RNA sequence: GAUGGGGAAGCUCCGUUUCAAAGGCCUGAUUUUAUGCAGGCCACCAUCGAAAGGGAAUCCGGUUAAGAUUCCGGAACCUGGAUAUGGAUUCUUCACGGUAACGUAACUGAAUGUGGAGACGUCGGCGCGAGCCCUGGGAGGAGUUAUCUUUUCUUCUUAAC
RNA sequence: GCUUGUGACGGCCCGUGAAAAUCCACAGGAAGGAAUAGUUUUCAUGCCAGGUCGUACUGAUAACCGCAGCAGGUCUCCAAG
RNA sequence: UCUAAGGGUCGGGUACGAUCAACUUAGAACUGGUACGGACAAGGGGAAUCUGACUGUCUAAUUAAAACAUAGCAUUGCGAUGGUCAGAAAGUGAUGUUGACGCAAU
């Protein structure tokens, strides 16, 4: 239902109690005109809404993935 | 480029109903459709719909009046009679 | 023989009024303290078509003297009355088009609409588009006022019986020819089921006093007695004369 | 192939015509088109300064 | 070429039965029923649609916060703010000239 | 004579404060870099003192008498100049061009105007100004 | 079409707010206790009558021998009920801002009053959206190929929220 | 372009083209409310619940009505080149 | 098989150029067993007499008409304690959410 950008807010969601599960999605997409790049979406499933945050940058991507709560059930792909 | 010699608006009824009815109807049609001067704001925006009801395009005043025309002959000669008799009760 | 048409009209099946779209009963304000000792002011908030009625209605708004609230009345719009005008109803009210005053309080020659028969009956006489009554006099002891009705009649009512000053809006409506069956069709469609009309001379005997014959003819005088009986009265009832009226009519 | 030869102007003769010229193209549509071209030419010429508003106003009504 | 069917049992084209044709992720045409368009609220004095107020269907106005139902000035979601100015001025002037009438007829009672 | 001057009371005819009475603190009669119109700085009353009666006593009266003020830059065309006049001495220094710009400065400005208005209302001065204009 | 009524030998007929002592909500007063009295209201007078009128809220994909806006999957929304956490607000108690139209994540509001929505004919041309139709490039598959055709057909989709 | 939706306008009337449930807002200011800390669930998030009956198929030159698998009758939506 | 006419989009200091997308209309050649709205589709026309003005209506299942209706014209009744009509009766009912520019009857 909802999309998210502020990366601080996203983290606070992952810790928001009722959030049991998240999921990470990977898609090949193209950069501007030319070559491709690896886009990755971070989907948190809340009680009444599903928040997803795109990280278009492969670098911020992985270093974000480790920051996830170890108590979270994360579905990879 | 005058389109009709006489019938005017009445040329919609064609050949039907006979001339003297169209004559009579045309007179009262030209009466009822035409735009009238607004007593209150003084633009000629007063038009009919629903016989006896005349309202103004802007300023949105509505006046009760004759069926096919804003002021009816009798209404006027009543308007002056009421002038007169009221002045008796003043002076 | 059958039951003829004008008899069937009485039990009101298909003959009742087509009332759905009408704005309401048009009445003067209930005759209360304010109106009979004082006056009371209201604003006409609207003037509106009434379905099946040739004259507009004026929705007029008054304060409620005994409670905090607005009580809306429906007058019959007098010609020249307009939206936003202030209307004055009462014994002590001034004489201007649109105000409601007891007949006893206006000089003769005043022209007045929607006038009550008995005081407080919330209006009776001269309500159709274009009509009005005139005051032709007063007799202050046993206080009366004499009026000429639209019919030409003269009648004497109570000086407290209320009129409203002026004539009713929508006049001249009958001057315009209907021109075609449909315009009449659409007319009665909003009134009652009176249209069209079969000539009782084109029916069979079982149907009408005028029915039957090997030619269409009434066969006996079409002037019927006042003392006639239901199923007999079709014709010119109680007619005291007949034939084309030559000469001015105009009550003396 | 037939539509191409149409746009090349063929098969349009008086014997290929069934609807009246009004039903084929409305006279009103031609006018509304044409009248909008003249209407909006005046507007640019006026907003360029190429034409002065007083000349524009006469042309708008002569249009 | 692809035709469509009603999505409910009412077969008829009534005002509450409007249809809309829509392309689904499946790559097919499906119908969908269309709620009647809401109408804008209106001013009590003049009768124009009053601006700043969200235009919803009546029970939907309970699903929305009060700032969608009002504008700030007094008589907010109610009258059209030119109409409020009118009845501000008119109020002040008539309360003023009311005082003008008290003191003038007070003089009439003193001098007469 | 020009009637928009330091004493004039007026009614706000447009905007959130429409229908509220103010006092011009100082006129800008023509122009500005911003505000490209004849305008005025006004101290005005937002939430009026409610009626008091004998039935009211103790510190309930203190409540009914609390006055919430406001201050505004206003186009002249939104003011309805009144005949009444109230004295601006106390808050003349308080209402300035520079009072607007920095909300913290506006809040202190109202603080003075609030005390100035509540003073004036008790001891029944400039009475009309402290009653709501009903429309 | 019941009801206080009024007719009628009577089956029943009339009347529908009508000549009637016509009823119930918000809370307080209880800390013998469970709910009497305390105010103030409101005087609306049954009810039945629409699977085309009015009307709170759901979508796509998938699935069956036979059910699907009902099942499965995913994603929503409405109504009622509870409620805590964050934010907002207040020492000028019940928000600020904009000249103004107005703004915004909030932003106390009983009685009573009022305003809007619900909520409305028909036809005409003009404007725009949607779906369809037409069509260029390219990426695939299929058809024709004695000869001719960079060709003929088809896939290229995006729901509510 | 076609079907449809919709807007701003215009023609028409002695025709001027339903009702109620229901929802909201405003005017009002009754009252209740803070500094040792009160008010706020029309802002966000969060918890629970959502009953009863219909739901198959035909809708017609064979699933209805015409004694019938009758050339009759029987309301409507989608609509390609 | 040709010709001409009819449009859109831009930059111009305070006369034009440039590109893109449309069937419509008229005129000209050539051409054929003189054919060509080539199937489909698609009004017979004229002069009078009788009769109803017109559009509309009816005998389902032998009569669609010149019959009924209609606008138009004229007549009648009636101011409510009423006119016309309903009911066995009634604290009953239709016209009537009405009032003579109205209702009712011919
Ligand atoms: Mg008999
Ligand atoms: Mg009735
Ligand atoms: Mg009939
Ligand atoms: Mg007849
Ligand atoms: Mg007749
Ligand atoms: Mg016969
Ligand atoms: Mg007989
Ligand atoms: Mg006889
Ligand atoms: Mg006979
Ligand atoms: Mg005869
Ligand atoms: Mg034309
Ligand atoms: Mg153009
Ligand atoms: Mg001009
Ligand atoms: Mg279905
Ligand atoms: Mg329709
Ligand atoms: Mg708003
Ligand atoms: Mg909004
Ligand atoms: Mg009964
Ligand atoms: Mg029911
Ligand atoms: Mg229903
Ligand atoms: Mg429905
Ligand atoms: Mg499916
Ligand atoms: Mg199925
Ligand atoms: Mg599911
Ligand atoms: Mg809830
Ligand atoms: Mg209320
Ligand atoms: Mg209401
Ligand atoms: Mg409806
Ligand atoms: Mg395709
Ligand atoms: Mg939906
Ligand atoms: Mg209308
Ligand atoms: Mg609303
Ligand atoms: Mg909430
Ligand atoms: Mg089914
Ligand atoms: Mg089926
Ligand atoms: Mg059988
Ligand atoms: Mg059959
Ligand atoms: Mg060219
Ligand atoms: Mg060009
Ligand atoms: Mg005929
Ligand atoms: Mg005919
Ligand atoms: Mg027959
Ligand atoms: Mg027979
Ligand atoms: Mg025939
Ligand atoms: Mg026959
Ligand atoms: Mg004749
Ligand atoms: Zn006007």
UniProtKB/Swiss-Prot annotation, chain A:
GO cellular component, one term: cytoplasm
Protein's cellular compartments: Cytoplasm
GO molecular function terms listed in the Swiss-Prot or TrEMBL record: structural constituent of ribosome
UniProt keyword terms in alphabetical order: Cytoplasm, Ribonucleoprotein, Ribosomal protein
Chief place where the protein resides: cytoplasm
Pfam family, one: Ribosomal_L38e
Coiled-coil residues: none
Biological process (GO), any one: cytoplasmic translation
Keyword flag DNA repair: no
Further information: Present with 50200 molecules/cell in log phase SD medium.
Subunit annotation: Component of the large ribosomal subunit (LSU). Mature yeast ribosomes consist of a small (40S) and a large (60S) subunit. The 40S small subunit contains 1 molecule of ribosomal RNA (18S rRNA) and 33 different proteins (encoded by 57 genes). The large 60S subunit contains 3 rRNA molecules (25S, 5.8S and 5S rRNA) and 46 different proteins (encoded by 81 genes).
Membership in a protein family: Belongs to the eukaryotic ribosomal protein eL38 family.
Biological role: Component of the ribosome, a large ribonucleoprotein complex responsible for the synthesis of proteins in the cell. The small ribosomal subunit (SSU) binds messenger RNAs (mRNAs) and translates the encoded message by selecting cognate aminoacyl-transfer RNA (tRNA) molecules. The large subunit (LSU) contains the ribosomal catalytic site termed the peptidyl transferase center (PTC), which catalyzes the formation of peptide bonds, thereby polymerizing the amino acids delivered by tRNAs into a polypeptide chain.
Protein name per Swiss-Prot or TrEMBL: Large ribosomal subunit protein eL38
Biological source species: Saccharomyces cerevisiae (strain ATCC 204508 / S288c) (Baker's yeast)
From Swiss-Prot, chain B:
The family this protein is said to belong to: Belongs to the eukaryotic ribosomal protein eL43 family.
Name of this chain's protein: Large ribosomal subunit protein eL43A
Top-rank taxon: Eukaryota
PANTHER family the UniProt entry points to: 60S RIBOSOMAL PROTEIN L37A, LARGE RIBOSOMAL SUBUNIT PROTEIN EL43
GO biological process: cytoplasmic translation
Residues bearing the modification Phosphoserine: 39
Gene expressing this chain: RPL43A
Cited NCBIfam families: eL43_euk_arch, PRK03976.1
GO CC annotation terms, alphabetical: cytosol; cytosolic large ribosomal subunit
Keyword Transferase attributed: no
Note in the entry: Present with 44600 molecules/cell in log phase SD medium. There are 2 genes for eL43 in yeast.
Subunit architecture: Component of the large ribosomal subunit (LSU). Mature yeast ribosomes consist of a small (40S) and a large (60S) subunit. The 40S small subunit contains 1 molecule of ribosomal RNA (18S rRNA) and 33 different proteins (encoded by 57 genes). The large 60S subunit contains 3 rRNA molecules (25S, 5.8S and 5S rRNA) and 46 different proteins (encoded by 81 genes).
From Swiss-Prot, chain D:
Cell compartment(s), UniProt: Cytoplasm
Phosphoprotein listed as a keyword: yes
Keyword Cytoplasm: yes
Positions carrying Phosphoserine: 27
GO CC entries: cytosol; cytosolic large ribosomal subunit
Keywords: Cytoplasm, Isopeptide bond, Phosphoprotein, Ribonucleoprotein, Ribosomal protein, Ubl conjugation
Misc. comment: Present with 97700 molecules/cell in log phase SD medium.
Sequence similarity: Belongs to the eukaryotic ribosomal protein eL19 family.
Role, per record: Component of the ribosome, a large ribonucleoprotein complex responsible for the synthesis of proteins in the cell. The small ribosomal subunit (SSU) binds messenger RNAs (mRNAs) and translates the encoded message by selecting cognate aminoacyl-transfer RNA (tRNA) molecules. The large subunit (LSU) contains the ribosomal catalytic site termed the peptidyl transferase center (PTC), which catalyzes the formation of peptide bonds, thereby polymerizing the amino acids delivered by tRNAs into a polypeptide chain.
Oligomer status and interactors: Component of the large ribosomal subunit (LSU). Mature yeast ribosomes consist of a small (40S) and a large (60S) subunit. The 40S small subunit contains 1 molecule of ribosomal RNA (18S rRNA) and 33 different proteins (encoded by 57 genes). The large 60S subunit contains 3 rRNA molecules (25S, 5.8S and 5S rRNA) and 46 different proteins (encoded by 81 genes). eL19 lies in close proximity to the binding site for eukaryotic initiation factor eIF4G.
Protein's gene: RPL19A
Swiss-Prot record, chain E:
InterPro entries to which the protein is assigned, alphabetical: Ribosomal_eL34, Ribosomal_eL34_C_sf, Ribosomal_eL34_CS
Gene Ontology terms: cellular component: cytosol; cytosolic large ribosomal subunit; preribosome, large subunit precursor
A GO BP annotation: ribosome biogenesis
Keywords, alphabetical: Cytoplasm, Ribonucleoprotein, Ribosomal protein
Localization of this protein: Cytoplasm
GO molecular function: structural constituent of ribosome
Family: Belongs to the eukaryotic ribosomal protein eL34 family.
Subunit structure: Component of the large ribosomal subunit (LSU). Mature yeast ribosomes consist of a small (40S) and a large (60S) subunit. The 40S small subunit contains 1 molecule of ribosomal RNA (18S rRNA) and 33 different proteins (encoded by 57 genes). The large 60S subunit contains 3 rRNA molecules (25S, 5.8S and 5S rRNA) and 46 different proteins (encoded by 81 genes).
Other known facts: Present with 23600 molecules/cell in log phase SD medium. There are 2 genes for eL34 in yeast.
Name used for this protein in its record: Large ribosomal subunit protein eL34A
Gene source species: Saccharomyces cerevisiae (strain ATCC 204508 / S288c) (Baker's yeast)
């Amino acid at each position: 239902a909802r999309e998210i950008t502020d990366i601080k807010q996203f983290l606070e969601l992952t810790r928001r109690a009722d959030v049991k599960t998240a999921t990470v999605k990977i898609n090949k997409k193209l950069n501007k005109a030319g070559k491709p790049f690896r886009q990755t979406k971070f989907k948190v499933r809340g009680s009444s809404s599903l928040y997803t945050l795109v990280i278009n940058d492969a670098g911020k991507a992985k270093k974000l993935i480790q920051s996830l709560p170890p108590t979270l059930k994360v579905n990879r792909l | 480029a005058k389109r009709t010699k006489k019938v005017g608006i009445t040329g919609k009824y064609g050949v039907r109903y006979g001339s003297s009815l169209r004559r009579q109807v045309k007179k009262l049609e030209i009466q009822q459709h035409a735009r009238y001067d607004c007593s209150f704001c003084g633009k000629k925006t007063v038009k009919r719909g629903a016989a006896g009801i005349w309202t103004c395009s802007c300023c949105k005043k509505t006046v009760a009046g004759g069926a096919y025309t804003v002021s009816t002959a009798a209404a006027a000669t009543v308007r002056s009679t009421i002038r007169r008799l009221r002045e008796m009760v003043e002076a | 023989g059958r039951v003829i048409r004008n008899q069937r009209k009485g039990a009101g099946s298909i003959f009742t009024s087509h009332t759905r779209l009408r704005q309401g009963a048009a009445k003067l304000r209930t005759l209360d303290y304010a109106e009979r000792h004082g006056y009371i002011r209201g604003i006409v908030k609207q003037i509106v078509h009434d379905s099946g009625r040739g004259a507009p209605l004026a929705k007029v708004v008054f304060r409620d003297p005994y409670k905090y609230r607005l009580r809306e009345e429906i007058f019959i719009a007098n010609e020249g009355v307009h939206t936003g005008q202030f209307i004055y109803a009462g014994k002590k009210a001034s004489l201007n088009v649109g105000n409601v005053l007891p007949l006893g309080s206006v000089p003769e020659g005043t022209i007045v609409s929607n006038v009550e028969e008995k005081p407080g009956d919330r209006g009776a006489l001269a309500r159709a588009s274009g009509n009005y009554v005139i005051i032709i006099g007063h007799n202050p002891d046993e206080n009366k006022t004499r009026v000429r009705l639209p019919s030409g009649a003269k009648k004497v009512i109570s000086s407290d019986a209320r009129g409203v000053i002026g004539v009713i809006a929508g006049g001249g409506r009958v001057d315009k020819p209907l021109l075609k069956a449909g315009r009449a069709f659409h007319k009665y469609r909003l009134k009652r089921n009176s249209w069209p009309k079969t000539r009782g001379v084109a029916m069979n005997p079982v149907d009408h006093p005028h029915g039957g014959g090997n030619h269409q003819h009434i066969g006996k005088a079409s002037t019927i007695s006042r003392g006639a009986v239901s199923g007999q009265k079709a014709g010119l009832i109680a007619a005291r004369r007949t034939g084309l009226l030559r000469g001015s009519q105009k009550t003396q | 192939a037939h539509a191409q030869s149409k746009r090349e102007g063929r098969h349009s003769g008086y014997g290929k015509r069934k609807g009246t010229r009004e039903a084929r193209l409305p006279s009103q549509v031609v006018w509304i088109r044409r009248l909008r071209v003249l209407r909006r030419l005046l507007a640019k010429y006026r907003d360029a300064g190429k034409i002065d508003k007083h000349l524009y106003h006469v042309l708008y009504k002569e249009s | 070429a692809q035709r469509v069917t009603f999505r409910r049992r009412n077969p008829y084209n009534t005002r509450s039965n409007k249809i809309k044709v829509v392309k689904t992720p499946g790559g097919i045409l499906r119908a969908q029923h269309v709620k009647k368009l809401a109408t804008r609220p209106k001013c009590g004095d003049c009768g124009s649609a009053l601006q700043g107020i969200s235009t919803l269907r009546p029970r939907q106005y309970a699903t929305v916060s009060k700032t969608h139902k009002t504008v700030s000035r007094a008589y907010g979601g109610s009258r059209c703010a030119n109409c409020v100015k009118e009845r501000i001025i008119r109020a002040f002037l008539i309360e003023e000239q009311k005082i003008v009438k008290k003191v003038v007829k007070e003089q009439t009672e003193a001098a007469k | 004579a020009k009637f928009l001057k330091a004493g004039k009371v007026a009614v706000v005819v447009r905007g959130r404060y429409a229908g509220k009475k103010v006092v011009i603190v100082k006129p800008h009669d023509e122009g500005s870099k911003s505000h490209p119109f004849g305008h005025a700085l006004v101290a005005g009353i937002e939430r009026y003192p409610l009626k008091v009666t004998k039935k009211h006593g103790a510190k309930k009266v203190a409540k009914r008498t609390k006055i919430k003020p406001f201050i505004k830059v206003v186009n002249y065309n939104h003011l309805l100049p009144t005949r009444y006049t109230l004295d601006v001495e106390a808050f003349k220094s308080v209402v300035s061009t520079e009072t607007f710009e920095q909300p913290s400065q506006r809040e202190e400005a109202k603080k003075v105007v609030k005390k100035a208005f509540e003073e004036r209302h008790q001891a029944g001065k400039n009475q009309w100004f402290f009653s709501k204009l009903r429309f």
